[PDB]
Ligand binder design. Structure first.
Ligand SMILES: [Mg+2]
Ligand SMILES: [Zn+2]
Lengths: 197, 41, 59, 158, 50, 247, 150, 49
């Protein structure tokens, strides 16, 4: 009948979906245990581009650059460096890979050449203790035993370490006061995306 | 591992011995720039 | 082959000077949730003491 | 909030980069010190490019283009060179922003946080570009003010 | 008629019991004039405008 | 730009995060394309007035829903069939997805409570939040995914940590009544509430932070204060001052 | 005051202690280096700043690098380059970046930075330095000629 | 912290019926949309209030 067919479709659908969601368990557990989280999650390219990235962007408009480029492309010579200038991440692609290997082999040769002349150029008994409790001071001590601590000595261990800059070095102090959540003031925070795809 | 640390201490001492006995004049010029000229005795 | 592999060691005695944890007690903990917190506490104490031991050269 | 701002001055064109800013509460008593105080402004804004004008006649040519809202060749040369090619470029004039987006693929925004950033740049401009040009910034405005005014009215010196 | 910010606040503080008066106060034919006065008391606001 | 005539009164609408598709919830769930005026996919389980529908920001082919039989329905865009249903004691007004955990959502329920669920194991909720005294209307997560804000039929709004059962802070005003809708802004710094006296108010996520640019000494002082508070959070006098909120 | 200075000296401590472990430098030499380093650090963290102080700091670090380089060859110890040499190079790079940010108009400081990058720094750092120079000093063809020549 | 606890910032007015819906703008922080019971939709500038 129609009814029991439908419930089978729900069962097969849920099992496929649950298996999909299981890949997010490693990410969630790591993030909940992380010492510091930076938002937005997406990384940012460093401030200063190292020239070789920049020179790819430029094109030709003046008559000089037109004639230079035309003569280059009609020949086999390339406009820019393959290894130095990165590009956006079939048979022609293999040839460019081969061209990269020859280009990489060349830089080895000149360096292998250079090393030669460099080598060439180089060539209590009486004490009573008041048993009364200090009710004023005890008002400041902790009453309850917080979770997840079972025995009161276990909670005592965590509190011993001082954190002020008076008792600790400056770099030790910074590690002790690392904030849990760090957010850039003006950037939009987006939801997690497949571990940065 | 005690002998390993005991082996290390003499390595420094032998290395330290070799650098004080013979010093080029250029090094003496540099050490005054880096360490200054102070006498405590 | 480097004759001394490890990083620069620090004297144990100066480190013990900057310690405020009672190692004498043998408290039992059978729960992992308690275990994680206690190991962090030793980690925080151990790291802070070591930096002060190196800082003795500043004197 | 990382975005680029284009600031036009009598001495030349300047390109600046914005790192971070508290956008919502910018027009508030405490936060306004972000742009007013020179040290805090240097924390969030840097000068990435500067192309000064060679001569007074060149400065007059750019002044005419900016008033008309067209993209002069001097402006386009600076923009094409040091801007990577997903880019937000801030302009003070909506018309020049539309012309840039037609000439080049950058996205232009004319209002919002950018309006407050430009006032911060204008107030602290002499400090950022100090020493990069031979002729002083204060004299650059005084010299251009006359030559721009003579052109409009067809002044005859005889 | 003119409605100040000081007067409009006093209506809002009255609660839901005076909701009808609040809806009549927001009438597009009215003139809504602002005031930057540190407080809510309105008698001092009007006499100063007068 | 375009208008679509319909036969039933729709109650809610949300848009796909990435694929230019919007779904609306009326008497039965429909999925609509911007370049397609009829619903391409129609989802139904029972005969009900569905109040709200929400897309999932992670694994964006999932859906969430709340209906009039005090039940929550989870759908699936790709396979075009509902996944699972859970019935509570009372109707849930709104459902909100956690933007950093794909399988967590929080439902605002009318029994003065908030329920956090893990959609894999829906038999029991993960946590219960119970500091409100009237019907909770809408919830919304902070973009950091560690906190959310809830509006109530009572004239107050609270902020809860996802792992705790109690409210961290409460906001209230004599002029503000029956907060209906609340949205946490995208930079995790401000909270805005939409209420029924015709005013929208803007609140701060943290009531003591300094919004402007800071110096190294101020930043060092700010972090030192925060670590001090959590170190001594269990002592009696620290608790008394910190948790005292005037109502 | 000395909060930032103390941070920098504690950052400088580990390579000095490793140098003590090498046997290259004696303990009194380490004390003298720490003293002069603190004295030079106090100069460049003041509210009133001068270029002479940055130049003196850079020159002291260069002299220390040369002394270490001369002593390593005599000893014959070539290990742990990263712990000492690279740490000093990053500190000097930070000093140069701060100095160049303060004084953009001075070409001579830029050329000093370029020469140091050629002598001790990775080629990508020199590429970034040339890009930063050509960003603000595009009106001097000689800078373009040097950049192309490199 | 208790001395400096000042959460209120500003209030926006202009709707003539109770607010029922809110939608934030994905690209700009300072733009939000609201919908009232009378049927009008208002776009608000958060920075300019
Ligand atoms: Mg009165
Ligand atoms: Zn008034």
């Amino acid at each position: 009948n129609k009814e029991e067919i439908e419930r089978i479709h729900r069962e097969v659908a849920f099992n496929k979906t649950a298996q999909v969601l299981s890949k997010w368990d490693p990410v969630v557990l790591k993030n909940r245990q992380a010492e510091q989280l930076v938002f937005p999650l997406e990384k940012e390219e460093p401030a200063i581009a190292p020239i070789e990235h920049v020179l790819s962007g430029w094109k030709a408009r003046t008559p000089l650059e037109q004639e230079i480029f035309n003569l280059l492309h009609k020949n086999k010579q390339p406009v820019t460096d393959p290894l130095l200038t990165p590009v956006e991440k079939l048979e022609e692609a293999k040839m460019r890979r081969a061209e990269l290997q020859r280009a990489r082999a060349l830089q080895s040769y000149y360096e292998a050449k250079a090393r030669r002349e460099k080598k060439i150029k180089s060539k209590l008994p009486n004490v009573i203790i008041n048993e009364k409790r200090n009710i004023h001071a005890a008002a400041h001590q902790v009453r309850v035993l917080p979770y997840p601590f079972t025995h009161h000595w276990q909670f005592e261990r965590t509190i011993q370490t001082p954190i002020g800059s008076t008792w600790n070095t400056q770099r030790a102090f910074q590690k002790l006061t690392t904030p849990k959540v760090v957010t850039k003031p003006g950037h939009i925070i987006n939801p997690i995306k497949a571990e940065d795809v | 591992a005690v002998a390993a640390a005991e082996e290390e201490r003499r390595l420094r001492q032998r290395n330290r011995l070799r650098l004080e006995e013979d010093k080029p004049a250029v090094e003496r010029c540099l050490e005054e720039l880096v360490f200054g000229d102070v006498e405590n005795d | 082959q480097d004759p001394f592999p490890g990083p620069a060691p620090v004297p144990v005695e100066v480190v013990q000077k900057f310690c405020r944890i009672d190692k004498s007690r043998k408290l039992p903990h059978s729960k992992a949730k308690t275990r994680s917190r206690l190991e962090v506490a030793e980690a925080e104490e151990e790291e802070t003491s070591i930096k002060a031991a190196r800082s003795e050269l500043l004197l | 909030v990382l975005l680029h701002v284009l600031f036009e001055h009598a001495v030349g064109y300047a390109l600046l980069a914005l790192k971070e800013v508290e956008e919502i509460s910018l027009l508030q008593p405490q936060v306004e010190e972000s742009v007013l105080n020179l040290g805090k402004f240097h924390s969030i804004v840097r000068l990435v490019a500067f192309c000064p004008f060679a001569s007074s006649q060149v400065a007059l040519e750019n002044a005419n283009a900016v008033s008309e809202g067209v993209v002069h060749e001097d402006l386009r040369l600076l923009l094409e060179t040091h801007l990577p090619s997903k880019v937000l470029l801030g302009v003070g004039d909506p018309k020049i922003g539309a012309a840039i987006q037609e000439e080049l693929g950058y996205n232009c925004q004319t209002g919002g946080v950018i309006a407050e950033i430009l006032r911060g740049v204008r107030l602290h401009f002499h400090n950022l570009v100090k020493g990069l040009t031979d002729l002083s910034a204060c004299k650059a405005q005084l010299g251009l003010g006359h030559s721009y005014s003579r052109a409009k009215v067809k002044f005859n010196v005889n | 008629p003119c409605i100040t910010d000081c007067v409009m606040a006093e209506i809002e503080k009255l609660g839901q019991k005076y909701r009808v008066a609040l809806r009549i106060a927001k009438d597009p034919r009215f003139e809504r004039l602002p005031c930057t006065h540190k407080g809510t008391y309105a008698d001092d606001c009007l006499v100063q405008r007068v | 730009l375009h208008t679509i005539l319909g036969k039933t009164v729709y109650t809610g609408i949300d848009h796909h995060w990435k694929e230019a598709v919007f779904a609306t919830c009326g008497q039965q769930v429909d999925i609509w394309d911007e370049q397609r005026t009829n619903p391409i996919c129609s989802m139904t389980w029972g005969f009900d007035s569905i109040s709200s529908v929400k897309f999932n920001p992670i694994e964006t082919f999932l859906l969430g829903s709340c209906a009039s039989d005090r039940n929550i329905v989870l759908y699936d865009m790709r396979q075009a069939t509902p996944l699972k249903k859970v019935i509570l004691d009372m109707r849930t007004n709104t459902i909100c997805w956690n933007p950093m955990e794909a399988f967590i959502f929080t439902a605002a329920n009318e029994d003065y409570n908030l329920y956090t669920f893990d959609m894999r194991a829906l038999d029991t909720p993960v946590m219960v939040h119970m500091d409100h005294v009237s019907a909770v209307l809408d919830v919304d997560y902070s973009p950091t995914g560690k906190e959310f804000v809830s509006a109530s039929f009572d004239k107050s709004i609270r902020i809860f940590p996802v792992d705790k059962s109690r409210s961290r802070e409460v906001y209230h005003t004599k002029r503000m009544q029956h907060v209906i809708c609340v949205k946490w802004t995208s930079d995790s710094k401000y909270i805005m509430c939409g209420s029924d006296e015709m005013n929208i108010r803007l609140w701060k996520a943290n009531a003591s932070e300094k919004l402007g640019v800071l110096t190294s000494r101020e930043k060092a002082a700010k972090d030192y204060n925060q670590k001090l508070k959590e170190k001594f959070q269990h002592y009696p006098h620290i608790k008394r001052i910190a948790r005292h909120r005037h109502l | 005051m000395a909060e930032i200075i103390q941070e920098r000296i504690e950052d400088r401590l580990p390579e000095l202690e490793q140098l003590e472990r090498i046997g290259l430098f004696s303990h009194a030499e380490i004390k003298a280096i720490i003293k002069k380093a603190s004295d030079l650090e106090y100069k460049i963290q003041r509210r009133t700043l001068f270029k002479e102080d940055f130049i003196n700091y850079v020159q002291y670090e260069i002299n220390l690098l040369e002394l270490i380089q001369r002593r390593r060859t005599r000893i014959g110890y070539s290990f742990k380059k990263d712990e000492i040499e690279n740490s000093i190079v990053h500190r000097v790079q930070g000093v140069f970046q701060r100095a160049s940010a303060k004084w953009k108009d001075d070409v001579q400081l830029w050329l000093s930075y370029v020469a140091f990058c050629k002598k001790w720094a990775t080629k990508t750092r020199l590429s970034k330095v040339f890009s930063a120079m050509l960003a603000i000093h595009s009106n001097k063809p000689a800078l373009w000629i040097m950049a192309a020549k490199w | 912290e208790r001395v400096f606890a000042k959460p209120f910032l500003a209030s926006l007015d202009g709707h003539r019926d109770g607010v029922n819906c809110l939608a934030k703008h994905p690209e700009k922080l300072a733009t939000v949309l609201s919908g009232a019971c009378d049927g009008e939709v208002r776009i608000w500038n958060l920075t300019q209030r």
